[PDB]
């Protein structure tokens, strides 16, 4: 339930190249891929079931 | 891309892989070459 975002997936390391003022990934289509972690700062790549 | 099609989407494979095919077409050309 990332900053209200409900959803189910996998997360994991992220490779990707957030800089850092994002919140969401939405990489492809209207998906959310990678999030920000909103008390951690770091980005985790989501990966559904 | 092809593993973004998670949503429902799937692409079952052909049942006659494209390496047996070619034994197919193998056989017919052998038999109409000789």
Same mark, same amino acid.
């Not at chain 1, 339930?1 to 990489?27: A, I, M, Y």
């Given at each position: ?7 189910? %997936?996998?997360? $994991? ?11 969401? %990934?939405?990489?492809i289509?209207?998906? $959310? ?5 909103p ?9 559904? +079931? | 891309? +092809? ?15 494209d ?6 077409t ?5 038999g109409?070459?000789?």
């Open positions: 339930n990332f900053n209200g975002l409900t959803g189910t %997936g996998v997360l $994991t390391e992220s490779n990707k190249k957030f800089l850092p003022f994002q919140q969401f %990934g939405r990489d289509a209207d998906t $959310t891929d990678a999030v920000r972690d008390q951690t700062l770091e980005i985790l790549d989501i990966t559904p +079931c | 891309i +092809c593993a973004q099609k998670f949503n429902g989407l799937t692409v079952l494979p052909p049942l006659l892989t390496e047996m095919i070619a034994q197919y193998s056989a017919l050309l052998a109409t070459i000789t």
